[PDB]
Design a binder for these strands. Structure first.
Ligand SMILES: *[C][O@@](*)(*)C1(*)(*)(*)=[C@@](*)(*)[C@@](*)(*)=C2(*)(*)(*)N(*)(*)=[C@@](*)(*)[C@@](*)(*)=C(*)(*)(*)(C(*)(*)([O])[C@](*)(*)C3(*)(*)(*)[C@](*)(*)[C](*)C(*)(*)([N@](*)(*)[C@@](*)(*)C4(*)(*)(*)=[C@@](*)(*)C(*)(*)(*)(F*)=C(*)(*)(Br*)C(*)(*)(F*)=[C@@]4(*)*)[C](*)[C@@]3(*)*)C2(*)(*)(*)=[N@@]1(*)*
Lengths: 730, 730
DNA sequence: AGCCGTAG
DNA sequence: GTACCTACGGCT
DNA sequence: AGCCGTAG
DNA sequence: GTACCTACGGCT
């Protein structure tokens, strides 16, 4: 018998029962889900404690930081047991602690973080079987005239769909299945009937078989040893798809949930695809904008519309992250070749953030259209979106080599990518060589491409010092590239010397840079500086003026700035990309080859598509010419026919043509019987037959395929290619 | 010479100049605009202080609230002069204080609030001519291949457009001209070139002619006397559109800006239109959803998409307010007849808020479709949206009497509306009478309608005590309607008496209600209560159980609850609506009549539209029959014709038909020459001619018009009408 | 501990 | 992932 | 000093 | 209108 809420957490919706043995606590992902849960629960014995998203990983955090965490405090207070040596099982307020997170890999992650907290801070709760996982449904199958059905697995969804269709139930396979990605999507009634009703619900009870084994696993998964974690996930993620209260071992739960999360982050969030150089968020935003018709030929659209359309139809995630991605693809200091044309305040290279998406407007850039060129000609694979309503492309055609041109930065689980941007003309040269020397071996190709791709070309210009770092990156996929800002020495009328900083290394925050100098001068770490002034403007660009003391040597001050500030920084190149669904550290030659392979695939697919469409068209045109030759009998037959169907059958017989051709004749407008229009049909047939011949020739001759790739890339480079900004010095 | 920051406001971007005479401070609406301004300014002399939206009205505000206001503190600190008796002009940091707010009525409002602050707290700044208003452009004309042009007036926009077109410049008919609603829409360069460059900018200098007159005006506009303000706006809003440094008198500026804001809020934000009962936000959301195809026949769409589409194409305001409006129209406890069908967490009648719009899904209700019925048949007026890209309806057809059915609540400037919801069947009865007794005078109509509309019918059910309040509201437009919750007396197994509260008055927050009782028991204001328990569930609804002491009398406790809690509350009826663009307090008879008038208008317009379309169709069909009669000559002519154009001209001559008919013949598919298809054209002509006759008869006979209105409303009531929830007791 | 870039 | 601040009016 | 609903 | 909290990794 323990007191209930009428100094416990404010956000906690407690139960009426004082008996811990009858009382249940649902720890719920966010306040949205918390609301549904609170409204749907039996308040007699079900308590609801909503959290603020990703709770602190207590494995990595100092105990002081963990105890200061508001979410951790709330959990400890709610449970009432205390922690570690002060842990008292007798004071437990709820004998069933139910973790209820969203039916997504992030939810799984939050579960893993919570289980880590309970294991490290309150182990006896797991030992004594007080910790449960709720199993909310993944899918709601909406039938016409029949009650909706709930599926808790992809397999179950497919099974129930097939069973319902066999039973004569009508769904709508497009919008028929709703995929719950967040508990906030379920109403209180649905949540109760599926997840919270003791009569219906399924709870997975967390068990602890081997404390020592569990201890080791938690260290690997949640600890600071990145290498151990990376190795754990590589060896096990291979075969994890094979590994009412249902018992589940904590070790197995942690392994499954964490590996699911890790692989999701790696293969489908944080890292670029080698062929188009796009993270999934980027691809979805650009395709959504394309499908919405936000093309360079039309007027800028409110950023909000693009974000909303993307979010609603694809990327089933937060609006902030989608908007941020969109903003970054619009920033000319972030991307060497922006993919979004922004109108309004898209932020500063300093600490000024972008305006709200309600104020900003955006559309695709001409270059972005080259990423999406002929996407409607089966040039790439399409898959069903998260819920299966619409189709989305797996990769973009990417007629421009975006991965190397724009680079990619990303933090995955147990790994990161950091690919620098490059000059389009240099990359094109490399591609042209690879096309011409298709049969060159790896060594020859590497040598050739390294000779043409001189190094990173950052949007912020500046200097690259030395070639070693670049060479290492190109040969191994890893390298330290030294970047330097540009300093000009100016002497004033009275005889004083000033350093003018005009260019900063890539990803250096202008404001933080200035503040850092000021701090260093204050601290006495930078000497010989009398005055520092920001004279930067829209009209003149970056102009930071550092006045040197009369006794100070300019060169000495410059060297100290290189040593003690981001005026000189190193770009840690890690050329990691997804290749055939696998993360790979790649050499420069490999990256070029994978791009070339993709472009060849695109041309073959485009040509195959066009050939099929040409044949379909030619088929119709042949039918029309037959009709035109027997025009009088055709018209007479149609007029004599009682029904369209009789006419159709009569035409098939009269002209020895198929259903498709007969229909096309029936669909011919009277305007087409004009002399010129008749001639046009004849001419169109001749032209299409010529096209068919050409398309067949392209398919037959790989040299023509390579030629097409070369010519079309050359066109893009002619129109969109630009001068190198970054200067390379010895 | 004053110090510049390298204890001043964090968000302030100060200037380099220490000379107040050369230094300028731009006080900017929000951080978005602040960013653009900061990036575009000349940092030598131009300081930027961004604010957090609507700064506190110091005229109304308690000194405690004023002193706590972070924005007010920031301004005082920035200027450095102090306030009132401690005001020191010599310490002024910037001799030019430039107010830069968004080119919208809200921006005008913020200006008025800032001018109120300066007048009350720092008057000498206005006296000495230190206060200026920035004048940004209204329009950006986007040319292809040519630099954009900026217009500061509608006349200037039109002039520049015509000049550019004469000069051979190409614009874009589909969003060539952008209407700036927010400074965040302008990039740094645009803002500088238009608004901040001393060489180009226009500043309006605020002057103070008569301190006493100004003092009185500020009291009227910004003070607590609502009646004085209401009277000021009614008399003056009539003729306010008639009343490089340009001087502007503070009195004139305040009057113009405040009246503009007030009228915008009154006529186009806070109050319903009498004909459809919709505030503009409601109309725009429902129409946006309609135009997007989010109909009851299709699958729920993510709330975000609806909000974004609404925001982007119409309602040029914050996403939070749009979403909140959408959520409220989905809440069955908020609306007697919900217009939005929500899926997911749309909040609770208590303190649980709705889930984020990224989780919730929404579509129109069947009843909402009755609001929008035949909107595509010129049944209502359309006007250009805020920027003129798209057309939007002024009012909805509203085939259901939404204003009275759903009610309306809103706070305008110097006024408010509070119309209670009513029973659809009762309202329909009233409408039917008004239709039948079209010529009845006001007195007769009032008597008749009051007899049929028994009183408010709240979504929360409960009780209405007495008829007086209802009668007053119906006769005057103002009334106090007493609402009461429902209490059941239950006796438990041990012999104790409990009060079970099952229904609460309209707009009573369930959680606050419970908390209020607990507080009153604690305070000793409620005696005889032993225990209070919330036994409410999704399955059983509202069930608050109050256990009474053995010595306590149930009836006494109930009466005390009615006295000291919202168990009994009064609905303050204020039946205020926009009639022909004017806010009007209306009687019940007037409200019914205005609705009936609207429905008659709709039927006449629909019939007129259908007649026109019928005639157009008949015209084509007549042409086709002529062609069918001379089929051989028609086909022969077309075949003999070199071009379609020659054929068209030949047909006009051969058949004595017009261009439209000739084209229709040319567009006829060969399938239509089948016997049945030919007959169908003949039959279609006969049918359409019958339709034309009927439509003409409807236009001729107002009795048929009233009949149509009656019948169609009756159909809606049959399908969507429901039982009275609210019980009326003596 | 604090910087980046998609996530809660 | 979450939580306050304000203008407006009319009751408490 | 605080409730409500479209606005910053 | 605005401002923090966190996971993830790899440099500082
Ligand atoms: C901003 O600031 C801030 C501060 C603090 C806080 N806290 C809590 C919460 C919050 C929030 O609210 C913020 C914001 C709001 C809004 C959101 N969203 C927006 C949007 C969305 C979507 F979906 C769309 Br389509 C749009 F358009 C918009 C964000 C966040 C805060 N805050």
């Amino acid at each position: 018998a323990l007191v209930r809420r009428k100094g416990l957490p404010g956000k906690l919706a407690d139960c009426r029962s004082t008996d811990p043995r009858k009382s249940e606590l649902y720890v719920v992902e966010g306040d949205s889900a918390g609301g549904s849960a609170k409204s749907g629960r039996d308040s007699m014995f079900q308590a609801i404690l909503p959290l603020r998203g990703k709770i602190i990983n207590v494995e990595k955090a100092r105990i002081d930081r963990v105890l200061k965490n508001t979410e951790v405090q709330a959990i400890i207070t709610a449970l009432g047991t205390g922690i570690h040596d002060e842990f008292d099982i007798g004071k437990l307020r709820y004998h069933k602690i139910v973790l209820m997170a969203d039916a997504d890999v992030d939810g799984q992650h939050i579960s893993t973080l919570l289980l880590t907290l309970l294991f490290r801070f309150m182990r006896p709760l797991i030992e004594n079987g007080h910790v449960f996982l709720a199993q909310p449904p993944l899918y709601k199958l909406k039938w016409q005239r029949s009650d909706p059905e709930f599926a808790y697995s992809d397999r179950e969804r497919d099974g129930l769909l097939e069973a319902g269709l066999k039973a004569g139930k009508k769904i709508n396979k497009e919008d028929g299945i709703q995929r719950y990605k967040g508990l906030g999507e379920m109403d209180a009634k649905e949540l109760w009937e599926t997840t919270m009703d003791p009569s219906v619900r399924v709870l997975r009870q967390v068990t602890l078989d081997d404390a020592a084994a569990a201890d080791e696993l938690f260290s690997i998964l949640m600890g600071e040893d990145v290498d151990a974690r990376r190795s754990f996930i590589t060896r096990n993620a291979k075969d994890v798809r094979f590994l009412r209260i249902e018992p589940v071992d904590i070790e197995q739960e942690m392994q499954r949930s964490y590996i699911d999360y890790a692989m999701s982050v790696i293969v489908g969030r944080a890292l670029p695809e080698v062929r188009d150089g796009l993270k999934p968020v980027h691809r979805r935003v650009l395709y959504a904008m394309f499908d919405s018709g936000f093309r360079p030929d039309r007027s800028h659209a409110k950023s909000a519309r693009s974000v909303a359309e993307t979010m609603g139809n694809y990327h089933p995630h937060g609006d902030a992250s989608i908007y941020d991605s969109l903003v970054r693809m619009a920033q000319p200091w972030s991307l060497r070749y922006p993919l979004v044309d922004g109108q309004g305040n898209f932020g500063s290279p300093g600490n000024d953030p972008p305006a709200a998406m309600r104020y900003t407007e955006a559309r695709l850039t001409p270059l972005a259209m080259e990423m999406l060129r002929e996407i409607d000609e089966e040039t790439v694979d399409f898959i069903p979106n998260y819920d299966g309503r619409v189709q989305e492309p797996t990769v973009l055609p990417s007629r421009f080599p975006n991965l190397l041109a724009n680079g990619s930065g990303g933090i995955a689980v147990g790994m990161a990518t950091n690919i620098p941007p490059h000059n389009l003309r240099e990359l094109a040269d490399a591609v042209f060589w690879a096309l011409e020397n298709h049969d060159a071996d790896e060594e020859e190709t590497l040598a050739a491409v390294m000779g043409r791709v001189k190094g990173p070309d950052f949007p912020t210009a500046g200097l690259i010092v030395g070639s070693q770092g670049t060479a290492d990156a190109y040969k191994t996929g890893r390298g330290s590239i030294r970047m330097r800002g540009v300093v000009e020495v100016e002497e004033d009328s009275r005889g004083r010397t000033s350093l003018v900083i005009t260019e900063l290394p890539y990803q250096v925050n202008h404001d933080n840079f200035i503040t850092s100098i000021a701090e260093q001068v204050r601290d006495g770490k930078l000497a010989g500086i009398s005055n520092i002034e920001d004279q930067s403007s829209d009209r003149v660009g970056l102009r930071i003026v550092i006045e040197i003391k009369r006794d100070a040597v300019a060169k000495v001050v410059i060297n100290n700035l290189y040593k003690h500030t981001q005026l000189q920084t190193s770009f840690g190149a890690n050329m990691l990309a997804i290749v055939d669904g696998v993360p790979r550290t790649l050499r420069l030659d490999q990256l070029i080859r994978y791009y070339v392979d993709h472009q060849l695939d695109v041309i073959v697919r485009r040509t195959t598509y066009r050939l099929r469409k040409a044949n379909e068209r030619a088929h119709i045109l042949r039918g029309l010419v037959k009709a035109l030759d027997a025009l009088d009998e055709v018209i007479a037959l149609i007029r004599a026919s009682e029904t369209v169907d009789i006419a159709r059958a009569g035409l098939i017989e009269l002209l020895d043509i198929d259903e498709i051709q007969a229909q096309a004749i029936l669909d011919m407008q009277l305007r087409r019987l004009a002399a010129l229009e008749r001639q046009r049909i004849i001419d169109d047939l001749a032209k299409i037959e010529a096209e068919i011949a050409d398309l067949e020739d392209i398919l037959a001759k790989p040299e023509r395929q390579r030629g097409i790739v070369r010519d079309e890339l050359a066109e893009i480079v002619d129109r969109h290619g630009d001068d190198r900004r970054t200067r390379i010095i010895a």
